Design a protein around this ligand. Structure first.
Ligand SMILES: Nc1ncnc2c1ncn2[C@@H]1O[C@H](CSCC[C@H](N)C(=O)O)[C@@H](O)[C@H]1O
Ligand SMILES: Nc1ncnc2c1ncn2[C@@H]1O[C@H](CSCC[C@H](N)C(=O)O)[C@@H](O)[C@H]1O
Lengths: 512, 520
């Protein structure tokens, strides 16, 4: 029927990180009042409203259906905090109130110019002064290609109508040689929609016609509306320097954000953007001074090849390798015993953010060798670059979740409610404490929904033993075959319970 | 001031060739009445109106300035055939009569939809039934990129600076782009690198016009043909033969394409996968069936030219030897082209080289190739032309004509050019950019260096070859502004500079020979 969706980058505790990063002063979370335009179902604000019981929230949408259905999901989870109303963006006065965080996900490209400027204008009168605005949209020249591909598909219809995919199986097969004038391109654009899902293609490329806009046209429409450009929720975008050094110099030399960004859209073929705005009074500082960056809880997710126990750190002739999120290849390596000492603690601390100084402290106590400020030196010198490349995540304040197993694990009422409604093809989607959406198998949903903090690690093991022994769950053990037996299923359910609880650990799914 | 530009693909003797290719019967050239919308200065109608003195014609434009200037340039050339008028396309109706050929070149994309469709219906009411229409426009999705590239320039020409103003920082933006793309990036921007770098080419006039001056808009083809069929017009084809031809795609795709047997689809998708920037399309009254079946029986009535120079001169090479492999050349590129083996191919090609830039009927190619070596029958010489040639004429490597043009392939010992081409060399468009631009008898524009511009204005038929060599020696040994070709000298000796001016003037006369610049 309708997708439930939630995004890490629309989370108020995130926008507050972007704000407190650039020298702004976003409002207080606990009392924060958030507003969502084009709320839809509204599952986007829910997890927030559960984390900060004192934070009121108001969503709006034009569809009466979505509003009512969402109101059901909101009532059934016992979430009294949020409020949803069915209206058109053109009715705002103000009232109702000013909000500390506003979020508009893409409705911007899908609606008329009249409502278009009207969005910015509500973001003028409905935004408390230190608050933060979020608007997502499509940008040129990335909109050109996708648009034309919707034209090509749109020009032949022989009925499916998914025969459009028989167009692309055509294109990649068609074309052929013509080595690389333009032909190496458009291969990527065709081949790259064969991914996503049958829903995406039909949504974007069929619609509901949407229109792209230009950076300078958007934030030029944000100006004159008395708003300014704070940044982008994707850090790895706003960062430059992958281009040759010569050009980089001449870029920074002009020192105008709108120029460097608008120009960065052309060389990347930038399709979308999620942009945050703020009132044009407050000055912004894009100088990153480490002394203000030591206050940010960070997470670098890496695991090493060798355990600390079996290795020594002070060794030089040895070079050890970590790994990032996936993969090999290993990413970085050392050699330098000041590097190992830190990275290893960025491993032990996986999925429990820690203050940046505390990385030097903990990396110090781990190995007493040198002073502390030298650990802070190597941390300042090349790390920050890694946090602007997206490999290090920053948070203020810490999210509410834990990196340890509580011996009677407990999750959010939300994730435990999500574990009721399937919307099942790969696996289930569940929202962790960061508003991000996690995949999860069926048995992990059966282990998950059962943690309210009442049951110890065994109680679930039992309830799984039945479900496997009885109908619902089944399982097999290698090589293929199995369907098991009374005792051997037991330890299988033990292993599968330890892995599932660890995944729930490092994914920010453990509230207590 | 304004562009003095002329294009081979707008020539009535050309549009009539594409018409008589597709089985139409365009009107008569001698009496032809041609009309040009947005003529500007109007230099496009002239070299026709002078070559066929009985052909009247009228250009029109909105700019009174341009119109008056053209009214001047025609007088200085003493051309009584053309006429220029200042009008809006909305006032053109029917009072100026019906025309056998109409040309609208690069307006349709620069003007409002109202004047836009007004163009098409105007092409309905003033076009003699069998006449032919020409319209050029920018198209998608090839116009998109180039547009965005005009966006960057239209943006960073404010902040990025130094200096004064438009085209300069525009070029510093191009060289900037290429600098900002190193080998550090090859996902996509190989495409944008090639497309931007491609703009470091063309001309300061082009760049200043297209990517700088007023807003132009592309269209989708099928929306164009769909706005023509709505105006009671039909799609004849394109003035670029090498365009309408498919087959570079694998057979699997090719066949599945041709099967549908609907032209407008087969073309449009060729706009999608080739990224077609512009189009020059000719239309006609529907009313008249057109046939895209190309019968060899209708193509032997076309004068053809294959432009070639041999690697091996005929004197020193045998013909019937089947162990020897020849190469030749195509036009000015320094790449060997074709090879054989079959001595009927040597026999033919060698007569296609002798006749370079001298069109001859395909039959006459078979005859001359027969007299070249008596061996086999004649119908086989017509055969080897049938098997693989026509493919080459659809790839643009063989040029076709109806009514072979007015020009000469030989040096008359007192060379002479058109009173037009001898006029153009008195004025711009400079400079030795590269060289001067001159209009041959085919409406094509040949660059010529300064010294060749000094010889070309000096052939009225009054001066012999030696009179040429003398006046060039003077211009050097005198107030000068000299230039040279290869070796290394450039300089002063009399006995050297004599034989040097002999060579340079003979080469210059050959270039005018094969370029259709010799009317006698
Ligand atoms: N004029 C209008 N007033 C209020 N909502 C509108 C609107 N026009 C469109 N919308 C809403 O904007 C939504 C865009 S789809 C966005 C879904 C949701 N924001 C998410 O992705 O999580 C649609 O559901 C539509 O109902
Ligand atoms: N409404 C109008 N009526 C008549 N001419 C117009 C017009 N609008 C634009 N034009 C003319 O169309 C011309 C397009 S520039 C084309 C120049 C010329 N056809 C060539 O290729 O060499 C301009 O010179 C402009 O004067």
């Amino acid at each position: 029927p309708y997708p439930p969706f939630t995004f890490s980058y629309t989370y108020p505790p995130y926008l507050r990180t972007i704000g407190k990063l650039f020298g702004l002063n976003p409002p207080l979370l606990e009392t924060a009042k958030v507003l969502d335009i084009g709320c839809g179902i509204g599952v986007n604000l829910l997890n927030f409203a559960e984390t900060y019981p004192k934070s009121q929230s108001l969503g709006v949408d034009l569809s009466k259906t979505q509003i009512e259905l969402g109101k059901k999901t909101i009532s059934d989870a016992k979430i009294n905090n949020v409020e949803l109303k069915a209206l058109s963006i053109l009715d705002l006065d103000e009232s109702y109130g000013k909000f500390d965080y506003i979020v508009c996900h893409g409705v911007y490209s899908w609606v008329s110019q009249e409502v278009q400027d009207k969005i910015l204008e509500v973001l003028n009168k409905l935004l408390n002064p230190n608050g933060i605005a979020f608007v997502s949209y499509n940008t040129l020249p990335g909109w050109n290609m996708q648009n034309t591909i919707r034209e090509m598909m749109m020009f032949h219809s022989h009925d499916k109508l998914q025969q459009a995919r028989l167009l692309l199986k055509f294109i990649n097969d068609s074309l052929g040689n013509s080595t690389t004038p333009y032909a190496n391109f458009l291969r990527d654009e065709a081949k790259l929609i064969s991914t996503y899902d049958d829903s995406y293609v039909l949504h974007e490329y069929l619609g509901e016609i949407n229109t792209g806009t230009y950076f300078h046209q958007f934030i030029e429409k944000a100006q004159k509306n008395h708003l300014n450009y704070l940044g982008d929720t994707s850090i790895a975008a706003m960062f430059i320097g992958n281009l040759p050094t010569k050009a980089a110099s001449k870029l920074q030399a002009i020192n105008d954000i709108v120029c460097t960004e608008q120009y960065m859209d052309f060389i990347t073929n930038r399709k979308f953007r999620s942009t945050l705005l703020c009132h044009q009074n407050i000055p912004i500082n894009r100088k990153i001074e480490f002394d203000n960056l030591k206050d940010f809880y960070t997470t670098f997710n890496i695991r090493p090849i060798s355990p600390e126990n079996k290795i020594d750190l002070n060794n030089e002739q040895e070079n050890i390798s970590f790994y990032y999120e996936n993969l090999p290849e290993p990413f970085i390596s050392t050699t330098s015993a000041i590097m190992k000492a830190i990275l290893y603690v960025y491993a032990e601390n996986i999925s429990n953010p820690i203050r940046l100084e505390q990385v030097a402290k903990e990396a110090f106590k781990k190995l007493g060798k040198y002073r502390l400020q030298d650990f802070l030196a190597t941390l300042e010198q090349h790390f920050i670059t890694l946090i602007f490349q997206g490999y290090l995540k920053i948070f203020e304040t810490k999210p509410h979740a834990i990196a340890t197993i509580t011996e009677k694990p407990k999750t959010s009422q939300f994730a435990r409610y999500q574990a009721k409604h399937a919307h099942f093809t790969n696996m289930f989607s569940i929202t962790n404490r960061l508003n991000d959406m996690i995949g999860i198998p069926i048995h992990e949903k059966y282990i998950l929904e059962m943690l309210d903090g009442t049951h110890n690690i065994d109680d679930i093991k039992k309830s799984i033993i039945e479900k496997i022994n009885s109908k619902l769950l089944t399982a097999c053990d290698n090589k293929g075959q199995v369907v098991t037996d009374p005792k051997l299923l037991k330890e299988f359910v033990d292993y599968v319970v330890a892995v599932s609880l660890e995944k729930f650990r490092i994914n920010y799914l453990l509230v207590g």
